[PDB]
PDB file of C-alpha atoms in Angstrom:
ATOM      1  CA  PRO A   1      32.083  56.162 138.873  1.00  0.00           C
ATOM      2  CA  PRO A   2      30.453  58.922 140.938  1.00  0.00           C
ATOM      3  CA  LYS A   3      29.257  62.006 139.024  1.00  0.00           C
ATOM      4  CA  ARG A   4      30.673  65.249 140.468  1.00  0.00           C
ATOM      5  CA  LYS A   5      31.177  68.900 139.609  1.00  0.00           C
ATOM      6  CA  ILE A   6      34.901  69.554 139.511  1.00  0.00           C
ATOM      7  CA  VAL A   7      37.186  72.500 138.959  1.00  0.00           C
ATOM      8  CA  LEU A   8      40.358  71.972 136.882  1.00  0.00           C
ATOM      9  CA  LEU A   9      43.494  74.096 136.940  1.00  0.00           C
ATOM     10  CA  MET A  10      45.054  73.866 133.489  1.00  0.00           C
ATOM     11  CA  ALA A  11      47.934  75.358 131.565  1.00  0.00           C
ATOM     12  CA  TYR A  12      48.812  75.629 127.881  1.00  0.00           C
ATOM     13  CA  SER A  13      51.256  77.187 125.444  1.00  0.00           C
ATOM     14  CA  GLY A  14      48.962  79.073 123.114  1.00  0.00           C
ATOM     15  CA  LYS A  15      51.211  79.599 120.110  1.00  0.00           C
ATOM     16  CA  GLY A  16      49.439  78.495 116.938  1.00  0.00           C
ATOM     17  CA  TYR A  17      46.063  78.240 118.679  1.00  0.00           C
ATOM     18  CA  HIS A  18      43.130  80.503 117.918  1.00  0.00           C
ATOM     19  CA  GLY A  19      41.919  80.645 121.502  1.00  0.00           C
ATOM     20  CA  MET A  20      40.639  78.702 124.517  1.00  0.00           C
ATOM     21  CA  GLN A  21      36.970  78.531 123.569  1.00  0.00           C
ATOM     22  CA  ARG A  22      35.977  75.763 121.183  1.00  0.00           C
ATOM     23  CA  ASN A  23      35.486  77.195 117.701  1.00  0.00           C
ATOM     24  CA  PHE A  24      41.400  76.668 113.259  1.00  0.00           C
ATOM     25  CA  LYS A  25      42.500  74.975 116.478  1.00  0.00           C
ATOM     26  CA  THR A  26      41.481  75.724 120.062  1.00  0.00           C
ATOM     27  CA  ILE A  27      42.566  74.437 123.467  1.00  0.00           C
ATOM     28  CA  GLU A  28      39.044  73.223 124.225  1.00  0.00           C
ATOM     29  CA  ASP A  29      39.028  71.080 121.067  1.00  0.00           C
ATOM     30  CA  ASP A  30      41.925  69.107 122.547  1.00  0.00           C
ATOM     31  CA  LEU A  31      40.558  69.224 126.104  1.00  0.00           C
ATOM     32  CA  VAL A  32      37.128  67.926 125.075  1.00  0.00           C
ATOM     33  CA  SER A  33      38.752  65.102 123.045  1.00  0.00           C
ATOM     34  CA  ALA A  34      40.856  64.177 126.048  1.00  0.00           C
ATOM     35  CA  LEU A  35      37.810  64.271 128.358  1.00  0.00           C
ATOM     36  CA  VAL A  36      35.857  61.938 126.075  1.00  0.00           C
ATOM     37  CA  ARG A  37      38.759  59.533 125.474  1.00  0.00           C
ATOM     38  CA  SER A  38      39.613  59.364 129.176  1.00  0.00           C
ATOM     39  CA  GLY A  39      36.001  58.405 129.833  1.00  0.00           C
ATOM     40  CA  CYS A  40      35.432  61.419 132.131  1.00  0.00           C
ATOM     41  CA  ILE A  41      32.425  62.422 130.066  1.00  0.00           C
ATOM     42  CA  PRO A  42      30.114  60.723 127.551  1.00  0.00           C
ATOM     43  CA  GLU A  43      30.552  61.613 123.879  1.00  0.00           C
ATOM     44  CA  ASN A  44      27.339  63.628 123.720  1.00  0.00           C
ATOM     45  CA  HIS A  45      28.567  65.945 126.509  1.00  0.00           C
ATOM     46  CA  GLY A  46      31.547  66.634 124.257  1.00  0.00           C
ATOM     47  CA  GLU A  47      29.133  67.448 121.443  1.00  0.00           C
ATOM     48  CA  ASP A  48      26.873  69.603 123.644  1.00  0.00           C
ATOM     49  CA  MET A  49      29.099  71.102 126.324  1.00  0.00           C
ATOM     50  CA  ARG A  50      26.079  72.574 128.141  1.00  0.00           C
ATOM     51  CA  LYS A  51      25.156  69.040 129.167  1.00  0.00           C
ATOM     52  CA  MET A  52      28.193  68.793 131.433  1.00  0.00           C
ATOM     53  CA  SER A  53      27.629  72.365 132.682  1.00  0.00           C
ATOM     54  CA  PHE A  54      30.961  73.467 131.194  1.00  0.00           C
ATOM     55  CA  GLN A  55      32.405  76.898 132.018  1.00  0.00           C
ATOM     56  CA  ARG A  56      35.778  78.498 131.366  1.00  0.00           C
ATOM     57  CA  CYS A  57      36.998  81.428 133.467  1.00  0.00           C
ATOM     58  CA  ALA A  58      39.100  83.206 130.858  1.00  0.00           C
ATOM     59  CA  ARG A  59      38.478  83.490 127.117  1.00  0.00           C
ATOM     60  CA  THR A  60      42.100  83.600 125.979  1.00  0.00           C
ATOM     61  CA  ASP A  61      42.448  84.724 122.349  1.00  0.00           C
ATOM     62  CA  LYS A  62      44.727  83.837 119.405  1.00  0.00           C
ATOM     63  CA  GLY A  63      48.216  82.819 120.496  1.00  0.00           C
ATOM     64  CA  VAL A  64      47.630  83.534 124.214  1.00  0.00           C
ATOM     65  CA  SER A  65      49.045  81.086 126.806  1.00  0.00           C
ATOM     66  CA  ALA A  66      47.888  80.153 130.321  1.00  0.00           C
ATOM     67  CA  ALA A  67      49.666  79.089 133.462  1.00  0.00           C
ATOM     68  CA  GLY A  68      46.433  79.036 135.478  1.00  0.00           C
ATOM     69  CA  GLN A  69      43.311  78.632 133.391  1.00  0.00           C
ATOM     70  CA  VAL A  70      40.300  77.348 135.308  1.00  0.00           C
ATOM     71  CA  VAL A  71      37.339  75.400 133.992  1.00  0.00           C
ATOM     72  CA  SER A  72      34.429  73.754 135.798  1.00  0.00           C
ATOM     73  CA  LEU A  73      32.334  70.822 134.593  1.00  0.00           C
ATOM     74  CA  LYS A  74      30.564  67.628 135.600  1.00  0.00           C
ATOM     75  CA  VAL A  75      32.482  64.373 135.137  1.00  0.00           C
ATOM     76  CA  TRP A  76      32.470  60.743 136.108  1.00  0.00           C
ATOM     77  CA  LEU A  77      35.123  60.939 138.799  1.00  0.00           C
ATOM     78  CA  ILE A  78      37.164  58.029 137.415  1.00  0.00           C
ATOM     79  CA  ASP A  79      40.327  56.694 139.101  1.00  0.00           C
ATOM     80  CA  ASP A  80      43.538  58.654 138.426  1.00  0.00           C
ATOM     81  CA  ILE A  81      41.507  61.175 136.466  1.00  0.00           C
ATOM     82  CA  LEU A  82      44.338  63.713 135.978  1.00  0.00           C
ATOM     83  CA  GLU A  83      46.778  61.118 134.673  1.00  0.00           C
ATOM     84  CA  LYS A  84      44.120  59.821 132.278  1.00  0.00           C
ATOM     85  CA  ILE A  85      43.061  63.194 130.852  1.00  0.00           C
ATOM     86  CA  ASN A  86      46.722  64.190 130.469  1.00  0.00           C
ATOM     87  CA  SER A  87      47.540  60.936 128.651  1.00  0.00           C
ATOM     88  CA  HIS A  88      45.193  62.148 125.872  1.00  0.00           C
ATOM     89  CA  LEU A  89      46.520  65.729 125.603  1.00  0.00           C
ATOM     90  CA  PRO A  90      49.567  66.994 123.708  1.00  0.00           C
ATOM     91  CA  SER A  91      52.502  67.845 126.015  1.00  0.00           C
ATOM     92  CA  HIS A  92      51.814  71.603 125.724  1.00  0.00           C
ATOM     93  CA  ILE A  93      48.345  71.400 127.310  1.00  0.00           C
ATOM     94  CA  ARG A  94      48.383  70.016 130.896  1.00  0.00           C
ATOM     95  CA  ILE A  95      45.763  69.549 133.587  1.00  0.00           C
ATOM     96  CA  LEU A  96      47.657  70.611 136.726  1.00  0.00           C
ATOM     97  CA  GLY A  97      45.042  70.299 139.481  1.00  0.00           C
ATOM     98  CA  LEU A  98      41.518  69.220 140.395  1.00  0.00           C
ATOM     99  CA  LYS A  99      39.093  70.198 143.161  1.00  0.00           C
ATOM    100  CA  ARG A 100      35.703  68.657 143.922  1.00  0.00           C
ATOM    101  CA  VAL A 101      33.075  71.354 144.440  1.00  0.00           C
ATOM    102  CA  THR A 102      29.357  71.678 145.253  1.00  0.00           C
ATOM    103  CA  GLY A 103      27.258  70.538 142.298  1.00  0.00           C
ATOM    104  CA  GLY A 104      26.028  74.045 141.543  1.00  0.00           C
ATOM    105  CA  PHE A 105      29.449  75.711 141.611  1.00  0.00           C
ATOM    106  CA  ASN A 106      30.099  77.538 138.364  1.00  0.00           C
ATOM    107  CA  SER A 107      33.678  78.796 138.118  1.00  0.00           C
ATOM    108  CA  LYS A 108      33.171  81.703 135.718  1.00  0.00           C
ATOM    109  CA  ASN A 109      30.293  83.032 137.837  1.00  0.00           C
ATOM    110  CA  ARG A 110      32.308  82.789 141.076  1.00  0.00           C
ATOM    111  CA  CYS A 111      35.691  84.224 140.064  1.00  0.00           C
ATOM    112  CA  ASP A 112      36.264  87.902 140.910  1.00  0.00           C
ATOM    113  CA  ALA A 113      39.263  88.857 138.761  1.00  0.00           C
ATOM    114  CA  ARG A 114      41.914  87.630 136.308  1.00  0.00           C
ATOM    115  CA  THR A 115      45.652  88.377 136.408  1.00  0.00           C
ATOM    116  CA  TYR A 116      47.671  88.265 133.173  1.00  0.00           C
ATOM    117  CA  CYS A 117      51.394  88.513 132.670  1.00  0.00           C
ATOM    118  CA  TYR A 118      52.946  89.987 129.548  1.00  0.00           C
ATOM    119  CA  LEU A 119      56.464  88.697 128.993  1.00  0.00           C
ATOM    120  CA  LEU A 120      58.442  90.947 126.665  1.00  0.00           C
ATOM    121  CA  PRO A 121      62.005  91.739 125.578  1.00  0.00           C
ATOM    122  CA  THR A 122      63.100  94.955 127.282  1.00  0.00           C
ATOM    123  CA  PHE A 123      64.056  96.713 124.046  1.00  0.00           C
ATOM    124  CA  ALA A 124      60.290  97.265 123.785  1.00  0.00           C
ATOM    125  CA  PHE A 125      60.963 100.119 126.257  1.00  0.00           C
ATOM    126  CA  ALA A 126      64.047 101.491 124.496  1.00  0.00           C
ATOM    127  CA  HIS A 127      63.608 105.146 123.540  1.00  0.00           C
ATOM    128  CA  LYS A 128      63.740 105.526 119.744  1.00  0.00           C
ATOM    129  CA  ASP A 129      66.288 108.380 119.845  1.00  0.00           C
ATOM    130  CA  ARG A 130      68.062 107.972 123.205  1.00  0.00           C
ATOM    131  CA  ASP A 131      68.614 104.191 123.411  1.00  0.00           C
ATOM    132  CA  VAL A 132      70.001 101.307 121.377  1.00  0.00           C
ATOM    133  CA  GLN A 133      67.133  99.345 119.821  1.00  0.00           C
ATOM    134  CA  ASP A 134      68.309  95.728 119.727  1.00  0.00           C
ATOM    135  CA  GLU A 135      68.950  92.811 122.103  1.00  0.00           C
ATOM    136  CA  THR A 136      71.966  94.641 123.605  1.00  0.00           C
ATOM    137  CA  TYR A 137      69.654  97.221 125.214  1.00  0.00           C
ATOM    138  CA  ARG A 138      69.425  97.036 128.987  1.00  0.00           C
ATOM    139  CA  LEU A 139      66.484  98.553 130.860  1.00  0.00           C
ATOM    140  CA  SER A 140      67.374 101.548 133.017  1.00  0.00           C
ATOM    141  CA  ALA A 141      65.894 102.226 136.449  1.00  0.00           C
ATOM    142  CA  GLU A 142      64.589 105.524 135.048  1.00  0.00           C
ATOM    143  CA  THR A 143      62.802 103.876 132.134  1.00  0.00           C
ATOM    144  CA  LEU A 144      61.318 101.169 134.387  1.00  0.00           C
ATOM    145  CA  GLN A 145      60.049 103.901 136.715  1.00  0.00           C
ATOM    146  CA  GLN A 146      58.439 105.600 133.675  1.00  0.00           C
ATOM    147  CA  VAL A 147      56.793 102.359 132.578  1.00  0.00           C
ATOM    148  CA  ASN A 148      55.413 101.889 136.062  1.00  0.00           C
ATOM    149  CA  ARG A 149      54.183 105.460 136.383  1.00  0.00           C
ATOM    150  CA  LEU A 150      52.294 105.073 133.102  1.00  0.00           C
ATOM    151  CA  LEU A 151      50.884 101.578 133.861  1.00  0.00           C
ATOM    152  CA  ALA A 152      49.565 102.803 137.225  1.00  0.00           C
ATOM    153  CA  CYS A 153      47.330 105.311 135.380  1.00  0.00           C
ATOM    154  CA  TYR A 154      45.304 102.321 134.145  1.00  0.00           C
ATOM    155  CA  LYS A 155      44.233 101.381 137.684  1.00  0.00           C
ATOM    156  CA  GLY A 156      40.689 102.291 138.616  1.00  0.00           C
ATOM    157  CA  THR A 157      37.519 102.103 136.589  1.00  0.00           C
ATOM    158  CA  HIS A 158      37.783 103.630 133.110  1.00  0.00           C
ATOM    159  CA  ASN A 159      35.996 103.619 129.760  1.00  0.00           C
ATOM    160  CA  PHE A 160      38.282 101.494 127.594  1.00  0.00           C
ATOM    161  CA  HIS A 161      36.399 101.995 124.301  1.00  0.00           C
ATOM    162  CA  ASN A 162      39.654 102.966 122.564  1.00  0.00           C
ATOM    163  CA  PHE A 163      41.244  99.738 123.820  1.00  0.00           C
ATOM    164  CA  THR A 164      38.818  97.406 122.036  1.00  0.00           C
ATOM    165  CA  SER A 165      36.596  97.376 118.943  1.00  0.00           C
ATOM    166  CA  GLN A 166      32.905  97.933 118.161  1.00  0.00           C
ATOM    167  CA  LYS A 167      32.221 100.025 121.286  1.00  0.00           C
ATOM    168  CA  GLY A 168      31.415 103.732 121.360  1.00  0.00           C
ATOM    169  CA  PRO A 169      32.602 106.440 123.819  1.00  0.00           C
ATOM    170  CA  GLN A 170      29.237 106.362 125.608  1.00  0.00           C
ATOM    171  CA  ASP A 171      28.980 102.579 126.016  1.00  0.00           C
ATOM    172  CA  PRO A 172      28.880 101.509 129.699  1.00  0.00           C
ATOM    173  CA  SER A 173      29.953  97.967 128.685  1.00  0.00           C
ATOM    174  CA  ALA A 174      33.321  99.515 127.744  1.00  0.00           C
ATOM    175  CA  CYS A 175      33.941 100.457 131.383  1.00  0.00           C
ATOM    176  CA  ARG A 176      36.322  98.023 133.104  1.00  0.00           C
ATOM    177  CA  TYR A 177      37.987  97.883 136.513  1.00  0.00           C
ATOM    178  CA  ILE A 178      41.772  97.470 136.758  1.00  0.00           C
ATOM    179  CA  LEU A 179      43.041  96.515 140.221  1.00  0.00           C
ATOM    180  CA  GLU A 180      46.785  96.431 139.565  1.00  0.00           C
ATOM    181  CA  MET A 181      49.181  97.020 136.710  1.00  0.00           C
ATOM    182  CA  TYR A 182      52.959  97.197 136.894  1.00  0.00           C
ATOM    183  CA  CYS A 183      56.232  95.959 135.412  1.00  0.00           C
ATOM    184  CA  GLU A 184      58.710  93.847 137.420  1.00  0.00           C
ATOM    185  CA  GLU A 185      62.467  94.390 137.459  1.00  0.00           C
ATOM    186  CA  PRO A 186      64.045  92.883 134.305  1.00  0.00           C
ATOM    187  CA  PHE A 187      65.939  89.583 134.224  1.00  0.00           C
ATOM    188  CA  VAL A 188      68.179  87.715 131.810  1.00  0.00           C
ATOM    189  CA  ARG A 189      67.485  84.274 130.318  1.00  0.00           C
ATOM    190  CA  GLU A 190      69.502  82.719 127.478  1.00  0.00           C
ATOM    191  CA  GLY A 191      71.595  85.896 127.395  1.00  0.00           C
ATOM    192  CA  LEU A 192      68.580  88.109 126.595  1.00  0.00           C
ATOM    193  CA  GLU A 193      66.836  90.637 128.846  1.00  0.00           C
ATOM    194  CA  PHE A 194      63.092  90.396 129.473  1.00  0.00           C
ATOM    195  CA  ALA A 195      60.581  91.890 131.862  1.00  0.00           C
ATOM    196  CA  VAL A 196      57.141  90.810 133.023  1.00  0.00           C
ATOM    197  CA  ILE A 197      54.179  93.187 133.077  1.00  0.00           C
ATOM    198  CA  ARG A 198      51.364  92.014 135.362  1.00  0.00           C
ATOM    199  CA  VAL A 199      47.773  93.224 135.119  1.00  0.00           C
ATOM    200  CA  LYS A 200      44.897  92.243 137.384  1.00  0.00           C
ATOM    201  CA  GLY A 201      41.456  93.289 136.173  1.00  0.00           C
ATOM    202  CA  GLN A 202      37.918  92.352 137.117  1.00  0.00           C
ATOM    203  CA  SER A 203      37.273  91.425 133.481  1.00  0.00           C
ATOM    204  CA  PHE A 204      38.807  92.159 130.080  1.00  0.00           C
ATOM    205  CA  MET A 205      37.439  92.935 126.593  1.00  0.00           C
ATOM    206  CA  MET A 206      38.753  91.751 123.222  1.00  0.00           C
ATOM    207  CA  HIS A 207      42.182  93.298 122.406  1.00  0.00           C
ATOM    208  CA  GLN A 208      42.188  95.227 125.684  1.00  0.00           C
ATOM    209  CA  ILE A 209      45.412  94.042 127.354  1.00  0.00           C
ATOM    210  CA  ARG A 210      47.318  93.944 124.072  1.00  0.00           C
ATOM    211  CA  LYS A 211      46.334  97.579 123.452  1.00  0.00           C
ATOM    212  CA  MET A 212      46.967  98.638 127.058  1.00  0.00           C
ATOM    213  CA  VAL A 213      50.503  97.268 126.689  1.00  0.00           C
ATOM    214  CA  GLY A 214      50.923  98.537 123.114  1.00  0.00           C
ATOM    215  CA  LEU A 215      50.105 102.129 124.065  1.00  0.00           C
ATOM    216  CA  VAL A 216      52.574 102.281 126.949  1.00  0.00           C
ATOM    217  CA  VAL A 217      55.202 100.679 124.702  1.00  0.00           C
ATOM    218  CA  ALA A 218      54.522 103.334 122.046  1.00  0.00           C
ATOM    219  CA  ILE A 219      54.709 106.207 124.567  1.00  0.00           C
ATOM    220  CA  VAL A 220      57.846 104.959 126.289  1.00  0.00           C
ATOM    221  CA  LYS A 221      59.682 104.474 122.983  1.00  0.00           C
ATOM    222  CA  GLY A 222      58.815 108.079 122.085  1.00  0.00           C
ATOM    223  CA  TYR A 223      56.188 107.588 119.364  1.00  0.00           C
ATOM    224  CA  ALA A 224      53.515 109.472 121.299  1.00  0.00           C
ATOM    225  CA  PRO A 225      53.597 111.931 124.195  1.00  0.00           C
ATOM    226  CA  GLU A 226      52.619 110.646 127.649  1.00  0.00           C
ATOM    227  CA  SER A 227      49.514 112.843 127.378  1.00  0.00           C
ATOM    228  CA  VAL A 228      47.935 110.421 124.861  1.00  0.00           C
ATOM    229  CA  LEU A 229      47.169 107.965 127.706  1.00  0.00           C
ATOM    230  CA  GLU A 230      44.847 110.485 129.379  1.00  0.00           C
ATOM    231  CA  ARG A 231      43.542 111.445 125.932  1.00  0.00           C
ATOM    232  CA  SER A 232      42.542 107.823 125.347  1.00  0.00           C
ATOM    233  CA  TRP A 233      39.894 108.114 128.106  1.00  0.00           C
ATOM    234  CA  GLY A 234      38.296 110.895 126.116  1.00  0.00           C
ATOM    235  CA  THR A 235      35.258 110.700 123.883  1.00  0.00           C
ATOM    236  CA  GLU A 236      37.276 111.046 120.691  1.00  0.00           C
ATOM    237  CA  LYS A 237      38.833 107.996 119.081  1.00  0.00           C
ATOM    238  CA  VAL A 238      42.529 107.332 119.542  1.00  0.00           C
ATOM    239  CA  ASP A 239      44.103 104.571 117.432  1.00  0.00           C
ATOM    240  CA  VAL A 240      45.986 102.468 119.985  1.00  0.00           C
ATOM    241  CA  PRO A 241      48.798 100.138 118.852  1.00  0.00           C
ATOM    242  CA  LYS A 242      48.062  96.504 119.649  1.00  0.00           C
ATOM    243  CA  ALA A 243      51.078  94.533 120.961  1.00  0.00           C
ATOM    244  CA  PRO A 244      51.509  90.886 119.823  1.00  0.00           C
ATOM    245  CA  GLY A 245      49.619  88.062 121.530  1.00  0.00           C
ATOM    246  CA  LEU A 246      52.770  85.907 121.949  1.00  0.00           C
ATOM    247  CA  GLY A 247      53.870  87.355 125.287  1.00  0.00           C
ATOM    248  CA  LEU A 248      50.428  87.293 126.951  1.00  0.00           C
ATOM    249  CA  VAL A 249      49.938  84.572 129.638  1.00  0.00           C
ATOM    250  CA  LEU A 250      46.930  84.099 131.919  1.00  0.00           C
ATOM    251  CA  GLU A 251      48.520  83.722 135.360  1.00  0.00           C
ATOM    252  CA  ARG A 252      45.630  83.414 137.816  1.00  0.00           C
ATOM    253  CA  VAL A 253      41.846  83.263 138.018  1.00  0.00           C
ATOM    254  CA  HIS A 254      40.870  84.823 141.345  1.00  0.00           C
ATOM    255  CA  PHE A 255      38.568  83.202 143.883  1.00  0.00           C
ATOM    256  CA  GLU A 256      39.524  85.336 146.899  1.00  0.00           C
ATOM    257  CA  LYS A 257      35.962  86.700 147.165  1.00  0.00           C
ATOM    258  CA  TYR A 258      34.501  83.191 147.046  1.00  0.00           C
ATOM    259  CA  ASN A 259      37.092  81.738 149.461  1.00  0.00           C
ATOM    260  CA  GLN A 260      36.158  84.572 151.810  1.00  0.00           C
ATOM    261  CA  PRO A 261      38.856  76.283 149.172  1.00  0.00           C
ATOM    262  CA  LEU A 262      40.006  77.056 145.637  1.00  0.00           C
ATOM    263  CA  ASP A 263      43.672  77.515 146.423  1.00  0.00           C
ATOM    264  CA  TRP A 264      46.317  76.008 144.162  1.00  0.00           C
ATOM    265  CA  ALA A 265      49.289  76.327 146.541  1.00  0.00           C
ATOM    266  CA  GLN A 266      49.957  72.578 146.344  1.00  0.00           C
ATOM    267  CA  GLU A 267      50.300  72.867 142.572  1.00  0.00           C
ATOM    268  CA  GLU A 268      52.927  75.631 142.543  1.00  0.00           C
ATOM    269  CA  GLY A 269      55.731  73.245 141.557  1.00  0.00           C
ATOM    270  CA  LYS A 270      53.658  71.927 138.656  1.00  0.00           C
ATOM    271  CA  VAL A 271      52.869  75.487 137.524  1.00  0.00           C
ATOM    272  CA  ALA A 272      56.564  76.488 137.627  1.00  0.00           C
ATOM    273  CA  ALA A 273      57.589  73.315 135.809  1.00  0.00           C
ATOM    274  CA  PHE A 274      55.076  73.807 132.993  1.00  0.00           C
ATOM    275  CA  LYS A 275      56.133  77.466 132.594  1.00  0.00           C
ATOM    276  CA  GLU A 276      59.717  76.356 132.185  1.00  0.00           C
ATOM    277  CA  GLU A 277      59.095  73.400 129.918  1.00  0.00           C
ATOM    278  CA  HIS A 278      56.535  75.069 127.643  1.00  0.00           C
ATOM    279  CA  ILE A 279      55.693  78.755 128.154  1.00  0.00           C
ATOM    280  CA  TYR A 280      59.072  80.488 128.703  1.00  0.00           C
ATOM    281  CA  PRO A 281      60.871  78.393 126.005  1.00  0.00           C
ATOM    282  CA  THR A 282      58.139  79.113 123.466  1.00  0.00           C
ATOM    283  CA  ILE A 283      57.964  82.858 124.128  1.00  0.00           C
ATOM    284  CA  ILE A 284      61.703  83.521 124.544  1.00  0.00           C
ATOM    285  CA  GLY A 285      62.722  81.126 121.773  1.00  0.00           C
ATOM    286  CA  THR A 286      60.231  82.748 119.416  1.00  0.00           C
ATOM    287  CA  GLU A 287      61.594  86.189 120.308  1.00  0.00           C
ATOM    288  CA  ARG A 288      65.198  85.028 119.862  1.00  0.00           C
ATOM    289  CA  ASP A 289      64.677  83.077 116.629  1.00  0.00           C
ATOM    290  CA  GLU A 290      61.742  84.788 114.899  1.00  0.00           C
ATOM    291  CA  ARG A 291      62.031  88.255 116.433  1.00  0.00           C
ATOM    292  CA  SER A 292      58.267  88.755 116.908  1.00  0.00           C
ATOM    293  CA  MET A 293      58.526  91.853 119.119  1.00  0.00           C
ATOM    294  CA  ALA A 294      61.281  93.478 117.051  1.00  0.00           C
ATOM    295  CA  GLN A 295      59.201  93.154 113.898  1.00  0.00           C
ATOM    296  CA  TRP A 296      56.069  94.544 115.543  1.00  0.00           C
ATOM    297  CA  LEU A 297      58.120  97.435 116.999  1.00  0.00           C
ATOM    298  CA  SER A 298      59.386  98.279 113.475  1.00  0.00           C
ATOM    299  CA  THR A 299      55.770  99.162 112.529  1.00  0.00           C
ATOM    300  CA  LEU A 300      55.387 101.855 115.190  1.00  0.00           C
ATOM    301  CA  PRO A 301      57.024 104.668 113.130  1.00  0.00           C
ATOM    302  CA  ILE A 302      54.049 104.674 110.731  1.00  0.00           C
ATOM    303  CA  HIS A 303      51.338 104.226 113.352  1.00  0.00           C
ATOM    304  CA  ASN A 304      48.994 107.221 113.282  1.00  0.00           C
ATOM    305  CA  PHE A 305      47.339 107.718 116.664  1.00  0.00           C
ATOM    306  CA  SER A 306      44.793 110.098 115.133  1.00  0.00           C
ATOM    307  CA  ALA A 307      43.926 108.227 111.902  1.00  0.00           C
ATOM    308  CA  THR A 308      40.305 107.552 112.876  1.00  0.00           C
ATOM    309  CA  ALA A 309      39.708 111.046 114.267  1.00  0.00           C
ATOM    310  CA  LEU A 310      41.259 112.573 111.124  1.00  0.00           C
ATOM    311  CA  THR A 311      38.691 110.791 108.976  1.00  0.00           C
ATOM    312  CA  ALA A 312      35.884 112.197 111.131  1.00  0.00           C
ATOM    313  CA  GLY A 313      35.319 108.569 112.162  1.00  0.00           C
TER     314      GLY A 313
END
């Protein structure tokens, strides 16, 4: 078969996985097995992924899902390649699209941004004194407006050293650019109310989104004053609550800059279908049955936002 550089649009439910990147199970473990078994790549390209020029656009962490992950690599362009790769993957990892590209196209180098969604039960925004705290809570317009006012403060370029680990106040690598961040109107599925927070950033650091969400959750519920968000830009350390990984879903890898044609419009039905068969059921079912968010929320009352600073740390 002809040898070509391709770009793959893929999706996965990330629950129980330790991340995308091959490392304890990872998405790429399964993807590389499927690529070898389908005959897309020789075995030694599975052993040394550099040999097929492999790149992934988003390093999703432990438990994180994807509706629109993008990888690029060189393959033998076999017949019915998508069907064949998919036949060797579990149902909860799916290759949704393929594009042929110029041989030197490297997806991670060409993408300009990533958008993530964070799907959460709305009682994560319920004020600890003013609102009921369980599944019966319904999000008010006022509280949604407060969430959005707070999330908008993240937009721009900021030093996010307090939103990751092993980076100091003066570290320019801790500066990141957020293009958009907001929370949609809430909706009900399976009799429970959820909302989606969407964040588009040029790039993200370890723990960053989970802590960006965790802080706004903590403030909105009343565990910290709204002033702590501004304070977290400061030089001094703030200990920022980290929300669970379960609700975090990579939605899109952006190629608008490059396109100005990596457009996945034709795959929108496949994306929606996978979200409904695998991502939504896993996240909502896990919230309903195992109460992941509720349990994490129950740990906020003892979170000390100043613990590190108090130890002169």
